[PDB]
Each structure stands twice: as C-alpha cells, then as structure tokens.
C-alpha cells in the first residue's frame, strides 16, 4: 500500500524537513508506504496556508503534516475542525480542545508555573514574544493573582531588526528602574539568542540575575556565552540525550551529509525537529494500527473540493483521528500518549539548568 | 557611551591637561540652603575663618 | 450604474444590519446602486467565513463589508492582502498596518491610558476578554511596567 | 601579572583563572599593557567572565585605544580609557584617511 500525506513547511524549516525525511527513511515499511507531498510557503500568511491546504486537500491526502503560527492557526484548526482531515504538528498547543488537531509540543505552562514556585519567585520580569501566542502569558498571570506574584510582563516581540540594539538596552534599562533581577525569556531560540547576546553586551549576566528559558530547547540556543557570567540560567528540554534510542539516533543523525540533510550534521537537534521525527513515527504507527485493525482508508482520489458546499466530511478521517489519539510509542521526546483533544499526557519534561 | 572621545592631551612639558569638557563635572550639584544666625541653631565656630 | 457589494454579517447582528439597511435607504441613489450580497454565517468559524468570502469573490462584487472576530481576522486581512478586495469593517482594529482593510472603530488604547493618568491611578485590576484582540492588555501591561503601576490582570 | 605566555591552545580558562585570582584581592582597576591583538582577546574574555559592569576600570596602555575592537565594552558601564597618538580631528589626517580608505 501507499499513503498520500500532506505537508506544509515554513520557509527555512531545513532541519525539520531533514528530520521529516529521516523519519521516513527510518519508519517506512514495505506494507504501507507514506508518500509525502511537500509545499513550502510562508506559514505566517494565512492565504498561502489556505491555498496550499486546499491544494493538498484537492489532492485527497488522508492526513496533513505541517506547522502553523498564531495567524494561520485559526485557518488550520477551523478547516480541519470542519473537514475532518487530521492535522499533525509540533507547533504550540491550541487553546481549545479542537478535534482533528494532533499537536506534539507538550504543555509547558504547568511546568513553568511549578519551576517558578520551585525558585520561590514573587517579583520578576516576564518577556514574551507576541507572535507565538499569549497562552503562556495568560497561565502565569492567572496564577499571579492566587500566588500573589508581581509579574512585570513586557512585550519584546515587535522590536524590528532595524533597531534591535537600542530597544533591548532600553528594555532592560527600564527594568533597572524597578531593579528587576529575575527574568523569564519566553521566545523562540532565534530570539533567545538575540536577547542573550544583548544581555551580555549590557553586562547584565553577573551574579544576581537569573533567567528562565521558557521553551523546550534550553540546549538548542547559543547557550555557551552566558555559562560563565556568574548569573544562573535554567529552563526545560523535552529531548533527553541520556536515552539510548536518542543517542543512537544522534549518531545516525549527526553522521548525515549536510548537502542532503542541511543542519543535520550536528550532535544536537531542535525539539521542533525531534517532534517532527517523532511525528513521522506516530503517523506510521497510526496507519499500522489501522492495518492491524483492518480499517479501510479507501477515500477516493476524486476527494472533491475544500470549498464544496454543503460541507463534505469523510468517515475514514474519524478513524484516523481515533487511531492517532490512541497510539503510544517511545520517541525522542520520551513516552507519548494523547487525550481525546490530541494533547499529550503521561509525558515528562527534563528540567535543565546551567551550572 | 557615545563613543571614544578626547578628554585631554599630554606632553613632556605639558603634564596632563584636560580639555575642560568633562560631563561628570556638572551633574552633581548642591541645594542652596537659606538660614539665619541665631543660637543654638546656627552659630559661627571659633575656627570658622579656617573653614 | 449598479455596484454589487459583499455583505458578511454575523448571525444576530440585527441592530447593525438594520442600521446597514437604513444606511442604504438613506445614502443610496439610482446613479450607482450599491447592491448587497448578504451572507449570514458563523463569523467565529474561519471555514464558513472563508467559504462565503470566496463565493462573494466568485460573483465579482467590487467591495465587501462585514464583521470579524479574533479567530477569523487572520483570514480576512490575508485574503484582502492578496486578492486586493477592499474590506470595510467596524470590528476591532487590526494591529498590523494591513493594506486593503478599513476599520471604522478608533484606537481605544491612548484614550483609556490617558484616563488612567487623569485619574492618577497606580494599582488597579484589569479584567479582560480575548475576543477583541489583546492589544488593549499589552498596552496597559507595557505602560504599567514603565509607569511602575501594578496590575492584577 | 604576566599574561603574555598564555598559549593560544589554552587561552580560555587561563584568563578566567587570571581574573579569579584577582577577585581574591577583589581588584577592580586594571591596566591592560598588551599588544592590540592581545587587548582584543582579553577584553573578549573580560565580557565573557562578566567583569565589565560598572565598578571595573580598564586602562588600555597603548597608542591604539581606538584601533582595537573596542565597541563590545562600550556599554557594560565599566569605564575604559587610554591613549591615542593619531588624532582624527586634524585636516591632514582626515584628508589622508579619505585618501587612505
């Protein structure tokens, strides 16, 4: 058998696409053959996400892999919520319990609150990038009332690259009016790097400061240059390199040619890429479970049109969603289970710290 | 913070002479305090002409 | 001349739709007969909003008017940013300087933050609802950090 | 303190150790009497160990105060001072610098 699957990838997702191809190389089988179709358009442009979705929907793919962002997420969640086409992603958890969204990136908000308790924080700054969605800003502010914290939340996202020098200086100098010392950084690593690079340049990594990197990629940033400042740094990582399967993967991963799998020739992997590699395993394992259960995927190739009115759900996507949310496997991100909402449960996050 | 600037010059005969453009010079100021000489609140010390 | 326009109204928007009708009865003239293609679908649902938007494009209306929500605004501003279809709306202002979207509701942020300074406030609760864009929350949070206020959001 | 014979193969922890020994005395005022290509390396390590906040004060004891990669310590707040023999205020120097660059 051969299985047509959809793919929307952000422009520049080179290590994720490499990890997707590696997952196909690892988890392919002769019985059923996952056959990608890949489209590469701006994920932040909802029209492009809509058009590519409807193109791959017109191809009749039985499920779509890809990514979404705070703009296009309302398209992907709502279209798939309507069209019953399961969407699998490593992107941030949807706020709602949307059906037909298979979202790998585990709940960070609970772990974040527990760590902030663990350090006994009461007054601190919290720097968020707006564009990842404010679900984490909500969950800390909701508890900040009950826990009587003094969260000094600040938007740091819309600072444009043309002037991202004076603004980070100004940002921390305004915090130095309150003389804040504890800081949470809640950004993608491409922004954690830049703000840490400014944090060293303004000198604010001496003893006393303490940064929490509220993302699943504590090791994936350019961490080294704050290792010796005398401040302390801590955060979270979902991948644990102590696992034999991860280590065996990392050898198999780092040894690849960078011409064929760009960014793979390293002993480290982005959590987004790791969740992508785990995603290919999960998609195989679901269709494996269908073939174990003798379920028929046989939606016709003439699947119709995304704009077809009245709306035209399909039965097999429900069975695909049932299987997807019931698969359990080990992967790079440890043990996985899903709830009926497609969010992960019975997992674990490795709390990391920079001694 | 604005960048590398001159603050003086030096020569074997002209021991270090500053350019009289030091910002530090101004900032720290002092309030003028008005009062009146009456005992025991404000009085002239015996050695006031040395102070 | 006759000029079809898209009308994209939420279910239950009668008092705005009646004002649209009364507005049409007031301003319209036989010289250029603005002719609403009305649609009434779940505005919070991006599929229905997109499906109707494509249909109103498919009848070649010269402009579209309607309301949107924090869910669907990422579709409308992106479709209008692509097909160049001009969309006129009084719903919550879009943060970006997106072309081809006209928003009749003014920016509240400066007026509210001015009232706080006029009241000389320094510690206040800020209860808020997501479904009009968190631009308002971000502006009080940023100002409170600068103005050393406290907020119990 | 001698800093010259720290070889390039291990010029990473030796500079941290060097300043950690100075932090036993809690020294703050420092003269860097080094060649340009060694001022850079020690200034680069001075940021990395965090010792360029206000409180420290480095004198670059060479005639090339502007010639090194000075910028990265401009903002930490530790004052930096030194000497330059060329003065770009001169018209002849400016006309040269145009003709030179």
Curated annotation (Swiss-Prot), chain A:
Mapped to this chain, the residue ranges on the Extracellular side of the membrane are 1-355
Localization of this protein:
Cell membrane; Postsynaptic cell membrane; Postsynaptic density membrane
Q: Sugar-bearing residues?
A: 232, 346
Boundaries of the shown chain within the full protein: 25 to 379 of 883
Another remark in the UniProt entry says: The postsynaptic actions of L-glutamate are mediated by a variety of receptors that are named according to their selective agonists. This receptor binds AMPA (quisqualate) > L-glutamate > kainate.
Q: How does it assemble?
A: Homotetramer or heterotetramer of pore-forming glutamate receptor subunits. Tetramers may be formed by the dimerization of dimers. May interact with MPP4. Forms a ternary complex with GRIP1 and CSPG4. Interacts with ATAD1 in an ATP-dependent manner. ATAD1-catalyzed ATP hydrolysis disrupts binding to ATAD1 and to GRIP1 and leads to AMPAR complex disassembly. Interacts with GRIP2. Interacts with GRIP1. Interacts with NSF via its C-terminus. Interacts with CACNG2, PICK1 and GRIP2. Interacts with GRIA1 and SYNDIG1. Part of a complex containing GRIA2, NSF and NAPA and/or NAPB.
Induction info? Down-regulated in the pyramidal cell layer of CA1 in the hippocampus by global ischemia.
Its family remark reads: Belongs to the glutamate-gated ion channel (TC 1.A.10.1) family. GRIA2 subfamily.
Q: What is the designated name of this protein?
A: Glutamate receptor 2
As for what it does, the entry says:
Ionotropic glutamate receptor that functions as a ligand-gated cation channel, gated by L-glutamate and glutamatergic agonists such as alpha-amino-3-hydroxy-5-methyl-4-isoxazolepropionic acid (AMPA), quisqualic acid, and kainic acid. L-glutamate acts as an excitatory neurotransmitter at many synapses in the central nervous system and plays an important role in fast excitatory synaptic transmission.
Disulphide bridges: 54-306
Tissues/organs with expression: Detected in forebrain. Detected in dendrites of neuronal cells. Expressed in the pyramidal cell layers of CA1 and CA3 and in the granule cell layer of the dentate gyrus.
Swiss-Prot record, chain B:
Give a short account of its post-translational modification: Palmitoylated. Depalmitoylated upon L-glutamate stimulation.
**Where would I find glycosylation on this chain?**
21, 28
Q: Which residues form a coiled coil?
A: none
Q: In which tissues is it expressed?
A: Detected in forebrain. Detected in dendrites of neuronal cells. Expressed in the pyramidal cell layers of CA1 and CA3 and in the granule cell layer of the dentate gyrus.
Kindly list the places in or outside the cell where this protein is found, as annotated in its UniProt entry.
Answer: Cell membrane; Postsynaptic cell membrane; Postsynaptic density membrane
Subunit structure, per the record? Homotetramer or heterotetramer of pore-forming glutamate receptor subunits. Tetramers may be formed by the dimerization of dimers. May interact with MPP4. Forms a ternary complex with GRIP1 and CSPG4. Interacts with ATAD1 in an ATP-dependent manner. ATAD1-catalyzed ATP hydrolysis disrupts binding to ATAD1 and to GRIP1 and leads to AMPAR complex disassembly. Interacts with GRIP2. Interacts with GRIP1. Interacts with NSF via its C-terminus. Interacts with CACNG2, PICK1 and GRIP2. Interacts with GRIA1 and SYNDIG1. Part of a complex containing GRIA2, NSF and NAPA and/or NAPB.
Q: What else is known?
A: The postsynaptic actions of L-glutamate are mediated by a variety of receptors that are named according to their selective agonists. This receptor binds AMPA (quisqualate) > L-glutamate > kainate.
* Role summary: Ionotropic glutamate receptor that functions as a ligand-gated cation channel, gated by L-glutamate and glutamatergic agonists such as alpha-amino-3-hydroxy-5-methyl-4-isoxazolepropionic acid (AMPA), quisqualic acid, and kainic acid. L-glutamate acts as an excitatory neurotransmitter at many synapses in the central nervous system and plays an important role in fast excitatory synaptic transmission.
Protein family: Belongs to the glutamate-gated ion channel (TC 1.A.10.1) family. GRIA2 subfamily.
Instruction: Let me see what the UniProt entry remarks about domains.
Output: The M4 transmembrane segment mediates tetramerization and is required for cell surface expression.
Swiss-Prot record, chain C:
Q: What's the PTM story here?
A: Palmitoylated. Depalmitoylated upon L-glutamate stimulation. Ubiquitinated by RNF167, leading to its degradation.
Q: Where does the protein end up?
A: Cell membrane; Postsynaptic cell membrane; Postsynaptic density membrane
Recorded superkingdom: Eukaryota
Q: What induces it?
A: Down-regulated in the pyramidal cell layer of CA1 in the hippocampus by global ischemia.
Q: In which tissues is it expressed?
A: Detected in forebrain. Detected in dendrites of neuronal cells. Expressed in the pyramidal cell layers of CA1 and CA3 and in the granule cell layer of the dentate gyrus.
Quaternary arrangement and interactors, per the entry?
Homotetramer or heterotetramer of pore-forming glutamate receptor subunits. Tetramers may be formed by the dimerization of dimers. May interact with MPP4. Forms a ternary complex with GRIP1 and CSPG4. Interacts with ATAD1 in an ATP-dependent manner. ATAD1-catalyzed ATP hydrolysis disrupts binding to ATAD1 and to GRIP1 and leads to AMPAR complex disassembly. Interacts with GRIP2. Interacts with GRIP1. Interacts with NSF via its C-terminus. Interacts with CACNG2, PICK1 and GRIP2. Interacts with GRIA1 and SYNDIG1. Part of a complex containing GRIA2, NSF and NAPA and/or NAPB.
**Any notes on this protein's domains?**
The M4 transmembrane segment mediates tetramerization and is required for cell surface expression.
Q: What is the protein's known function? A: Ionotropic glutamate receptor that functions as a ligand-gated cation channel, gated by L-glutamate and glutamatergic agonists such as alpha-amino-3-hydroxy-5-methyl-4-isoxazolepropionic acid (AMPA), quisqualic acid, and kainic acid. L-glutamate acts as an excitatory neurotransmitter at many synapses in the central nervous system and plays an important role in fast excitatory synaptic transmission.
Q: Which family does it belong to?
A: Belongs to the glutamate-gated ion channel (TC 1.A.10.1) family. GRIA2 subfamily.
Task: From the Swiss-Prot or TrEMBL record, give the protein name.
Answer: Glutamate receptor 2
Query: Where does this protein come from, organism-wise?
Result: Rattus norvegicus (Rat)
